[PDB]
Design a protein around this ligand. Structure first.
Ligand SMILES: CO[C@@H]1O[C@H](CO)[C@@H](O[C@@H]2O[C@H](CO)[C@@H](S[C@H]3O[C@H](CO)[C@@H](S[C@@H]4O[C@H](CO)[C@@H](O)[C@H](O)[C@H]4O)[C@H](O)[C@H]3O)[C@H](O)[C@H]2O)[C@H](O)[C@H]1O
Ligand SMILES: [Ca+2]
Ligand SMILES: [Ca+2]
Ligand SMILES: [Ca+2]
Ligand SMILES: [Ca+2]
Length: 302
């Protein structure tokens, strides 16, 4: 029903919109690294998230480094399984080339172009798909102008050869925080969005105002990853400031995906250790973070 209602997504003056120009706000979950916690990504768990949480988007976080796709490309099958599940379930799906320790997106540019050529040929005709070409560029010598924009300028045409219209989300500097630099030197492709990521126990008003700057320049922003914890993961969850951010995103209709769907023992994890991989979770199988995120997604779901 989600993709059935909205169909093809596009950007209109910085806003994510459906095929009739109506605002669309996607809320869902991100997987943790598919090379570590791939058992939580399957048709049953995505159905349970769709039906019980009300998600309308699922993000497949394909790490490149850290035992991910570069060393073992069999993780692509997990990405495929997620995409095909999303298509069956009628929800949107984000294919995320999850760089992090490989902080400059150009480190694996050739591989990224090959990977996105393959994904876009297989799935380009479905409106469900969203590409995220560089999770979190980071480092003082990784900038929008020198490193990230030019990367996007090479990868985007590769996807566009096969898929002329699906949304492409492009990471920004400082772990996808530097949306204002990107907004002052935007890509030309009309269906692009810039990533903005945050952690409720670490980031506040200063980054909120930076996001407002970017939006004021006409740039579209997709909060493709955010955590309820501190970036450090100490002190537990910070749901007070997480709720300020929730309202911030709602005021501006920003789409988001929470990090992350795993049973790992870290505050941002949505599930408790031992939680069922195929969903159907009791309330005891959800962490404090998961309980809160589920509530945020349910209360806006139809
Ligand atoms: C300005 O300071 C920086 O801010 C950034 C946030 O804007 C910080 O980036 C964030 O760093 C977090 C800590 O690494 C990660 S949490 C996330 O990803 C990490 C790394 O993959 C993993 S830890 C990882 O887990 C594996 C599986 O259990 C394990 O095998 C491996 O040994 C272990 O390293 C964690 O579980 C995930 O939640 C955020 O993704 C990132 O945005 C930056 O750290 C900080 O310097
Ligand atoms: Ca492996
Ligand atoms: Ca090709
Ligand atoms: Ca398409
Ligand atoms: Ca080049």
């Amino acid at each position: 029903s989600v993709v059935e209602e909205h169909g093809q997504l596009s950007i209109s003056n910085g806003e994510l919109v459906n095929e009739r120009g109506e605002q669309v706000q996607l809320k869902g979950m991100s997987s943790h690294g598919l090379q570590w916690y791939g058992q939580f990504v399957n048709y049953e768990s995505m159905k349970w998230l769709r039906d019980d949480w009300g998600i309308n988007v699922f993000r497949a976080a394909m790490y490149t480094s850290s035992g991910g796709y570069i060393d073992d490309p069999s993780v692509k099958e997990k990405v495929k399984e997620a995409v095909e599940a999303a298509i069956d379930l009628d929800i949107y799906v984000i294919i995320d080339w999850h760089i992090l320790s490989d902080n400059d997106p150009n480190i694996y540019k050739e591989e990224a172009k090959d990977f996105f050529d393959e994904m876009s040929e297989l799935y380009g005709d479905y409106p469900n798909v969203i590409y995220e070409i560089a999770n979190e560029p980071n480092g003082s010598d990784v900038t929008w102008g020198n490193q990230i924009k030019p990367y996007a300028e090479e990868v985007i045409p590769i996807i566009r050869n096969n898929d002329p219209n699906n949304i492409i989300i492009v990471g920004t500097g400082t772990w996808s925080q530097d949306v204002h630099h990107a907004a002052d030197n935007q890509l030309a492709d009309p269906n692009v969005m810039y990533a903005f990521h945050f952690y409720a126990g670490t980031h506040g008003q200063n980054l909120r105002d930076q996001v407002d700057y970017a939006l004021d320049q006409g740039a579209a922003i997709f909060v493709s990853e955010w955590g309820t914890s501190a970036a450090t993961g100490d002190g537990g969850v910070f749901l007070d400031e997480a709720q300020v951010w929730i309202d911030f995103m709602d005021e501006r209709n920003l789409s988001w995906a929470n990090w992350s769907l795993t049973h790992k023992d870290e505050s941002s994890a949505a599930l408790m250790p031992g939680a069922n991989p195929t969903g159907g979770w009791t309330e005891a199988e959800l962490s404090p973070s998961g309980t809160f995120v589920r509530e945020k997604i349910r209360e806006s779901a139809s």
